[PDB]
Design a protein around this ligand. Structure first.
Ligand SMILES: [Mg+2]
Ligand SMILES: [Mg+2]
Ligand SMILES: [Mg+2]
Ligand SMILES: [Mg+2]
Ligand SMILES: [Mg+2]
Ligand SMILES: [Mg+2]
Ligand SMILES: [Mg+2]
Ligand SMILES: [Mg+2]
Ligand SMILES: [Mg+2]
Ligand SMILES: [Mg+2]
Ligand SMILES: [Mg+2]
Ligand SMILES: [Mg+2]
Ligand SMILES: [Mg+2]
Ligand SMILES: [Mg+2]
Ligand SMILES: [Mg+2]
Ligand SMILES: [Mg+2]
Ligand SMILES: [Mg+2]
Ligand SMILES: [Mg+2]
Ligand SMILES: [Mg+2]
Ligand SMILES: [Mg+2]
Ligand SMILES: [Mg+2]
Ligand SMILES: [Mg+2]
Ligand SMILES: [Mg+2]
Ligand SMILES: [Mg+2]
Ligand SMILES: [Mg+2]
Ligand SMILES: [Mg+2]
Ligand SMILES: [Mg+2]
Ligand SMILES: [Mg+2]
Ligand SMILES: [Mg+2]
Ligand SMILES: [Mg+2]
Ligand SMILES: [Mg+2]
Ligand SMILES: [Mg+2]
Ligand SMILES: [Mg+2]
Ligand SMILES: [Mg+2]
Ligand SMILES: [Mg+2]
Ligand SMILES: [Mg+2]
Ligand SMILES: [Mg+2]
Ligand SMILES: [Mg+2]
Ligand SMILES: [Mg+2]
Ligand SMILES: [Mg+2]
Ligand SMILES: [Mg+2]
Ligand SMILES: [Mg+2]
Ligand SMILES: [Mg+2]
Ligand SMILES: [Mg+2]
Ligand SMILES: [Mg+2]
Ligand SMILES: [Mg+2]
Ligand SMILES: [Mg+2]
Ligand SMILES: [Mg+2]
Ligand SMILES: [Mg+2]
Ligand SMILES: [Mg+2]
Ligand SMILES: [Mg+2]
Ligand SMILES: [Mg+2]
Ligand SMILES: [Mg+2]
Ligand SMILES: [Mg+2]
Ligand SMILES: [Mg+2]
Ligand SMILES: [Mg+2]
Ligand SMILES: [Mg+2]
Ligand SMILES: [Mg+2]
Ligand SMILES: [Mg+2]
Ligand SMILES: [Mg+2]
Ligand SMILES: [Mg+2]
Ligand SMILES: [Mg+2]
Ligand SMILES: [Mg+2]
Ligand SMILES: [Mg+2]
Ligand SMILES: [Mg+2]
Ligand SMILES: [Mg+2]
Ligand SMILES: [Mg+2]
Ligand SMILES: [Mg+2]
Ligand SMILES: [Mg+2]
Ligand SMILES: [Mg+2]
Ligand SMILES: [Mg+2]
Ligand SMILES: [Mg+2]
Ligand SMILES: [Mg+2]
Ligand SMILES: [Mg+2]
Ligand SMILES: [Mg+2]
Ligand SMILES: [Mg+2]
Ligand SMILES: [Mg+2]
Ligand SMILES: [Mg+2]
Ligand SMILES: [Mg+2]
Ligand SMILES: [Mg+2]
Ligand SMILES: [Mg+2]
Ligand SMILES: [Mg+2]
Ligand SMILES: [Mg+2]
Ligand SMILES: [Mg+2]
Ligand SMILES: [Mg+2]
Ligand SMILES: [Mg+2]
Ligand SMILES: [Mg+2]
Ligand SMILES: [Mg+2]
Ligand SMILES: [Mg+2]
Ligand SMILES: [Mg+2]
Ligand SMILES: [Mg+2]
Ligand SMILES: [Mg+2]
Ligand SMILES: [Mg+2]
Ligand SMILES: [Mg+2]
Ligand SMILES: [Mg+2]
Ligand SMILES: [Mg+2]
Ligand SMILES: [Mg+2]
Ligand SMILES: [Mg+2]
Ligand SMILES: [Mg+2]
Ligand SMILES: [Mg+2]
Ligand SMILES: [Mg+2]
Ligand SMILES: [Mg+2]
Ligand SMILES: [Mg+2]
Ligand SMILES: [Mg+2]
Ligand SMILES: [Mg+2]
Ligand SMILES: [Mg+2]
Ligand SMILES: [Mg+2]
Ligand SMILES: [Mg+2]
Ligand SMILES: [Mg+2]
Ligand SMILES: [Mg+2]
Ligand SMILES: [Mg+2]
Ligand SMILES: [Mg+2]
Ligand SMILES: [Mg+2]
Ligand SMILES: [Mg+2]
Ligand SMILES: [Mg+2]
Ligand SMILES: [Mg+2]
Ligand SMILES: [Mg+2]
Ligand SMILES: [Mg+2]
Ligand SMILES: [Mg+2]
Ligand SMILES: [Mg+2]
Ligand SMILES: [Mg+2]
Ligand SMILES: [Mg+2]
Ligand SMILES: [Mg+2]
Ligand SMILES: [Mg+2]
Ligand SMILES: [Mg+2]
Ligand SMILES: [Mg+2]
Ligand SMILES: [Mg+2]
Ligand SMILES: [Mg+2]
Ligand SMILES: [Mg+2]
Ligand SMILES: [Mg+2]
Ligand SMILES: [Mg+2]
Ligand SMILES: [Mg+2]
Ligand SMILES: [Mg+2]
Ligand SMILES: [Mg+2]
Ligand SMILES: [Mg+2]
Ligand SMILES: [Mg+2]
Ligand SMILES: [Mg+2]
Ligand SMILES: [Mg+2]
Ligand SMILES: [Mg+2]
Ligand SMILES: [Mg+2]
Ligand SMILES: [Mg+2]
Ligand SMILES: [Mg+2]
Ligand SMILES: [Mg+2]
Ligand SMILES: [Mg+2]
Ligand SMILES: [Mg+2]
Ligand SMILES: [Mg+2]
Ligand SMILES: [Mg+2]
Ligand SMILES: [Mg+2]
Ligand SMILES: [Mg+2]
Ligand SMILES: [Mg+2]
Ligand SMILES: [Mg+2]
Ligand SMILES: [Mg+2]
Ligand SMILES: [Mg+2]
Ligand SMILES: [Mg+2]
Ligand SMILES: [Mg+2]
Ligand SMILES: [Mg+2]
Ligand SMILES: [Mg+2]
Ligand SMILES: [Mg+2]
Ligand SMILES: [Mg+2]
Ligand SMILES: [Mg+2]
Ligand SMILES: [Mg+2]
Ligand SMILES: [Mg+2]
Ligand SMILES: [Mg+2]
Lengths: 102, 141, 55, 115, 150, 109
RNA sequence: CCCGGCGAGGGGAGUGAAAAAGAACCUGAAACCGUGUACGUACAAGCAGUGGGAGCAUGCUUAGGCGUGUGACUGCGUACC
RNA sequence: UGUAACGGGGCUAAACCAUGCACCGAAGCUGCGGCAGCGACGCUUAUGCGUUGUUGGGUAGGGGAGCGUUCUGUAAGCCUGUGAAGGUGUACUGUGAGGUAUGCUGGAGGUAUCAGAAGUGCGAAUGCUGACAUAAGUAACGAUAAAGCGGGUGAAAAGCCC
């Protein structure tokens, strides 16, 4: 059932049904996305690739949310040299629910 | 998305036997330390003792190249005022033939609670008989 | 003489682990009167082993 | 206009002592000690976002190297085998496949054996 | 500060921080480093800037319609009750009643009224003209202010 | 019922009194009252009087019954210390803290 | 009223809107010292954290898990001025 | 002081010389997000961008733009016993100084916005005052002239009275 695909410059081993958090997409809150960047499809027989990507495999998904992650604090500090620095960071994400491993 | 880690309770550990008759000490000791650590297993987690129980029998017959039978020295301090003891590879086998493999493996294991935990796995023996027939320990090479 | 740097709550406690004093848990009973007292000691009223030996 | 600074300072110290929650001894109790712990924690946190990406790669590579040698190929030859077959699958997933679906994994080692 | 110039303890020898005075501002109950002196915060304003500002603000009252120009504005007798009652018809509350001929009757009758203020045409101010929600100028007062600002 | 009694400003440090209080904790009142008779300490007399208070306290005001009563919570908090000057050799002065303790006992069932 | 030495101190009862407003009396922080609950902790070496992470305990929506507390084991890591 | 002159185990190849493809390997380079500085720029419009390059380690130090505090004006306004400030928790939120809402405590003050003025921000100064730790229930209890027992009084007696 599970299939592998590349999205936000990284790959996800994903099953049909489950939600996946991935890097922000230029897509509306409740639209839909088709990944034709599918790397692998597993089942009884495994459809692996001797080229980049499969052939006619397309992962269809639905966008769930468009949130921001947990606030990471960044602390730079040079011991004894009168230098420190503070900086927060909340990374943007897009949760997607998978609805079709072809 | 949180990659797999071996959970101790779920770890199914296996039993093995290795005849060390005519084996090179270090090249044996390495392959032992690789197994005891559990590197060969595809569910290897560095913070968990995933490795297998090994029974090394005929430890006294272990081979060493060159002049290391006489020349290789095993130093140790007694923790005393000037108490540095030494013992050559012959002298070591004459007295305590188990220590030879023990020491060679222990050096190649990691240093800490888990490193000591994965040494407990190793079972060395001078003779050919072992009393762990109860585990059905399979033959390894 | 003199500490290099101050010990903790933890060590102070660790040291005090033996300071906990033990109870008696071994009170006697006088045969006649039935008054509690320490073993081999007289009672408050003035008994020992079921016989008055004190005014 | 005199400015008492008891309300603001308290709010500054209390903020840091909240980050130091959990630390041993003075490091959780005492601003002057906690403030160091909280900066150091920041420094280690900053460095460990870099080391997390390293550690996990080693972890995956070990898993892949383990799972490959069960099928009779070393890591070094396997990855070249996959690169030469233009397979784009990463360590993170090869390591995921290695643990979960070995019957699948075997096909990648065969796919690598071709090259 | 009151107190002696004497060193509380000597320079060296005692394992203590060198002090020179009880009155030092790092010590308690003595000092304040940069103690304030009574000072004059009045700052110069150029005649032309003051006039220019009045000309600026007084012209914005015409755009905003706060400026209610009128003919003769005067109470009958020195009574607040009448002044308060006549502002109901005029539909005013918070006001600056500028007058050329300053009537004592009108003055006295707006002293107790908080939101009303009765300045003379000569004594208009920058802050006052802005502060009050409406400004009632007498035709004579407009004529005096016109000549004053010029 | 819980029924508190407590000696406030008890002239003895916490650390000393607290040593006795650790004997009696979750023990039956009749058993606890015995111990402090044969505990050779000043603090035992001081802690007893509070317990012996707490029992009468409990039986008169609220709960009644002496047989079913346990010392559920006993604790000793440090009270106000009184500062006093101890003169030492070579002209120097120390400060002896005459310490006090707040002893509380709770006698529930 | 009650315990105590017709003490200190307390528990009641009462007054008050309130008495952890009861005279050591508005608020009542922090250091510091305790009592009780959860987890860890008696073969393990070091700035005591930090990335990883099992278990256990709780809160939740449950027929997935996600918070919270703890943190066994493990990579890195010699305070501030 | 202890092997102590491969970092260790250990190695006759796991050393060296030569060549050959592999792979690992950094915050380097690429991938996908996000922010900001300067230069262009289509010419939008006095700006942000279809955009587009490029940069963004930093002590002394120079230049920019802000947060917060007490006070004055806006304010005899607005929020507040249907619970202010303060204290103490929790949950959101901003790139940061921070901000917002609310539980408990508290029991009466608080103050938007945009301006104005500063006793305007503390971890260090063998800083100054108060409080509280540590060593520690440790040393010590002040002349080695000496106590003992019976009775009294008392809640209690080695010490008080006889
Ligand atoms: Mg900061
Ligand atoms: Mg290491
Ligand atoms: Mg030192
Ligand atoms: Mg203790
Ligand atoms: Mg002791
Ligand atoms: Mg003030
Ligand atoms: Mg504070
Ligand atoms: Mg501060
Ligand atoms: Mg606090
Ligand atoms: Mg914590
Ligand atoms: Mg923790
Ligand atoms: Mg604190
Ligand atoms: Mg705390
Ligand atoms: Mg706390
Ligand atoms: Mg990586
Ligand atoms: Mg003076
Ligand atoms: Mg002088
Ligand atoms: Mg002089
Ligand atoms: Mg000194
Ligand atoms: Mg000092
Ligand atoms: Mg004074
Ligand atoms: Mg003064
Ligand atoms: Mg000052
Ligand atoms: Mg000053
Ligand atoms: Mg001036
Ligand atoms: Mg000036
Ligand atoms: Mg002039
Ligand atoms: Mg005049
Ligand atoms: Mg007004
Ligand atoms: Mg007293
Ligand atoms: Mg005592
Ligand atoms: Mg009652
Ligand atoms: Mg105290
Ligand atoms: Mg004395
Ligand atoms: Mg003396
Ligand atoms: Mg002197
Ligand atoms: Mg003297
Ligand atoms: Mg009595
Ligand atoms: Mg008396
Ligand atoms: Mg009485
Ligand atoms: Mg009395
Ligand atoms: Mg009395
Ligand atoms: Mg009384
Ligand atoms: Mg009384
Ligand atoms: Mg009283
Ligand atoms: Mg009382
Ligand atoms: Mg009461
Ligand atoms: Mg009452
Ligand atoms: Mg009442
Ligand atoms: Mg009442
Ligand atoms: Mg009422
Ligand atoms: Mg109140
Ligand atoms: Mg109240
Ligand atoms: Mg109440
Ligand atoms: Mg009441
Ligand atoms: Mg009450
Ligand atoms: Mg009460
Ligand atoms: Mg009450
Ligand atoms: Mg209260
Ligand atoms: Mg009370
Ligand atoms: Mg209350
Ligand atoms: Mg109150
Ligand atoms: Mg008072
Ligand atoms: Mg007090
Ligand atoms: Mg109080
Ligand atoms: Mg008051
Ligand atoms: Mg009041
Ligand atoms: Mg109070
Ligand atoms: Mg408190
Ligand atoms: Mg407190
Ligand atoms: Mg504390
Ligand atoms: Mg404490
Ligand atoms: Mg445990
Ligand atoms: Mg436990
Ligand atoms: Mg255990
Ligand atoms: Mg051992
Ligand atoms: Mg253990
Ligand atoms: Mg240690
Ligand atoms: Mg170390
Ligand atoms: Mg930690
Ligand atoms: Mg952590
Ligand atoms: Mg972590
Ligand atoms: Mg877990
Ligand atoms: Mg559980
Ligand atoms: Mg942890
Ligand atoms: Mg263990
Ligand atoms: Mg570690
Ligand atoms: Mg280190
Ligand atoms: Mg260093
Ligand atoms: Mg030496
Ligand atoms: Mg030597
Ligand atoms: Mg060496
Ligand atoms: Mg040498
Ligand atoms: Mg030498
Ligand atoms: Mg080496
Ligand atoms: Mg060596
Ligand atoms: Mg090496
Ligand atoms: Mg090599
Ligand atoms: Mg190559
Ligand atoms: Mg990298
Ligand atoms: Mg990068
Ligand atoms: Mg880069
Ligand atoms: Mg984009
Ligand atoms: Mg980018
Ligand atoms: Mg270029
Ligand atoms: Mg730049
Ligand atoms: Mg640069
Ligand atoms: Mg820079
Ligand atoms: Mg500004
Ligand atoms: Mg500001
Ligand atoms: Mg501000
Ligand atoms: Mg603000
Ligand atoms: Mg404020
Ligand atoms: Mg104001
Ligand atoms: Mg206004
Ligand atoms: Mg208004
Ligand atoms: Mg209103
Ligand atoms: Mg209103
Ligand atoms: Mg209201
Ligand atoms: Mg009320
Ligand atoms: Mg109401
Ligand atoms: Mg309301
Ligand atoms: Mg105020
Ligand atoms: Mg507040
Ligand atoms: Mg607060
Ligand atoms: Mg409070
Ligand atoms: Mg609230
Ligand atoms: Mg209330
Ligand atoms: Mg009031
Ligand atoms: Mg008032
Ligand atoms: Mg204001
Ligand atoms: Mg401003
Ligand atoms: Mg301002
Ligand atoms: Mg000022
Ligand atoms: Mg200042
Ligand atoms: Mg400072
Ligand atoms: Mg301070
Ligand atoms: Mg600071
Ligand atoms: Mg500083
Ligand atoms: Mg100081
Ligand atoms: Mg200081
Ligand atoms: Mg000692
Ligand atoms: Mg001692
Ligand atoms: Mg001693
Ligand atoms: Mg002594
Ligand atoms: Mg002496
Ligand atoms: Mg003596
Ligand atoms: Mg004496
Ligand atoms: Mg003498
Ligand atoms: Mg004498
Ligand atoms: Mg004597
Ligand atoms: Mg005598
Ligand atoms: Mg006698
Ligand atoms: Mg007598
Ligand atoms: Mg008698
Ligand atoms: Mg008597
Ligand atoms: Mg009498
Ligand atoms: Mg009595
Ligand atoms: Mg007494
Ligand atoms: Mg006598
Ligand atoms: Mg005597
Ligand atoms: Mg005498
Ligand atoms: Mg006599």
């Amino acid at each position: 059932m599970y299939a592998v695909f590349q999205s936000g410059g990284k790959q996800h081993r994903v099953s049909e049904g489950q939600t996946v958090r991935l890097e922000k997409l230029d897509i509306a809150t409740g639209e839909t996305v088709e990944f034709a960047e599918v790397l692998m499809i597993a089942n009884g027989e495994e459809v692996k690739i001797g080229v980049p990507f499969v052939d006619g495999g397309v992962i269809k998904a639905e966008v769930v949310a468009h949130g921001r992650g947990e606030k990471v604090k960044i602390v730079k500090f040079r011991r004894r040299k009168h230098y420190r620095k503070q900086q927060g960071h909340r990374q943007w994400f897009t949760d997607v629910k998978i609805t079709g491993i072809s | 998305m949180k990659t797999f880690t071996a959970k101790p309770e779920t770890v199914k550990r296996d039993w093995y036997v290795v005849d060390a008759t005519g084996k090179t000490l270090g090249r044996l000791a390495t392959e032992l330390a690789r197994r005891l650590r559990g590197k060969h297993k595809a569910e290897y987690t560095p913070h968990v003792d995933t490795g297998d129980y090994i029974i090394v029998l005929n430890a006294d017959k272990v081979a060493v190249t060159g002049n290391k039978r006489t020349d290789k020295v095993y130093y140790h301090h007694t923790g005393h005022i000037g108490g540095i003891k030494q013992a050559t590879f012959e002298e070591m086998i004459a007295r305590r033939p188990e220590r030879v493999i023990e020491i060679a493996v222990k050096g190649m294991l990691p240093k800490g609670p888990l490193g000591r935990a994965m040494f407990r796995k190793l079972k060395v023996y001078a003779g050919n008989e072992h009393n762990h027939a109860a585990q059905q320990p399979q033959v390894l090479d | 003489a003199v500490q290099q740097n101050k010990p903790t709550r933890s060590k102070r406690g660790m040291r005090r682990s033996h300071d906990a004093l033990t109870a008696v848990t071994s009170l006697s009973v006088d045969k006649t009167s039935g008054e509690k007292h320490l073993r081999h000691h007289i009672t408050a009223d003035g008994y020992y082993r079921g016989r008055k030996v004190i005014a | 206009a005199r400015v008492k600074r008891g309300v603001i300072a308290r709010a500054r110290h209390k903020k840091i002592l909240k980050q130091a929650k959990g630390y041993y001894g003075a490091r959780s109790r005492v601003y002057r000690v906690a403030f160091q712990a909280v900066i150091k924690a920041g420094q280690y946190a900053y460095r460990d976002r870099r080391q997390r990406k390293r550690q996990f790669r080693q972890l995956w590579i070990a898993r892949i190297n383990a799972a490959a040698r069960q099928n009779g190929i070393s890591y070094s030859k396997f990855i070249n085998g996959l690169k030469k077959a233009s397979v784009e699958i990463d360590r993170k997933i090869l390591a995921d496949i290695a643990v979960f679906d070995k019957v699948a994994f075997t096909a990648l080692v065969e796919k690598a054996k071709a090259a | 500060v009151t107190g002696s110039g004497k060193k509380p303890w000597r320079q060296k020898g005692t394992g203590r921080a060198r002090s020179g005075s009880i009155k030092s501002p790092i010590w308690r109950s003595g000092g304040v480093t940069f103690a304030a002196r009574p000072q004059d915060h009045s700052q110069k304003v150029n005649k032309k800037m003051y006039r220019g500002a009045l000309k600026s603000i007084l012209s914005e009252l015409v755009r905003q319609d706060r400026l209610i120009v009128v003919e003769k504005f005067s109470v009958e007798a020195p009574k607040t009750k009448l002044l308060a009652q006549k502002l109901k018809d005029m539909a005013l509350e918070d006001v600056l009643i500028i007058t050329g001929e300053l009537d004592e009757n009108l003055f006295l009758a707006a002293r107790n009224l908080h939101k009303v203020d009765v300045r003379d045409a000569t004594g208009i101010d920058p802050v006052s003209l802005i502060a009050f929600d409406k400004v009632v100028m007498t035709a004579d007062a407009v004529k005096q202010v016109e000549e004053m600002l010029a | 019922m819980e029924t508190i009694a407590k000696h406030r400003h008890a002239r003895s440090s916490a650390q000393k009194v607290r040593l006795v209080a650790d004997l009696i904790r979750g023990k039956k009142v009749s058993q606890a009252l015995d111990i402090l008779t044969y505990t050779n300490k000043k603090a035992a007399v001081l802690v007893k009087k509070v317990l012996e208070s707490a029992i009468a306290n409990a039986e008169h005001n609220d709960g009644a019954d002496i047989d079913d009563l346990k010392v559920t919570k006993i604790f000793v908090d440090e009270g106000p210390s009184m500062k006093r000057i101890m003169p030492r050799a070579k002209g120097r002065a120390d400060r002896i803290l005459k310490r006090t303790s707040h002893i509380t006992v709770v006698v529930s069932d």
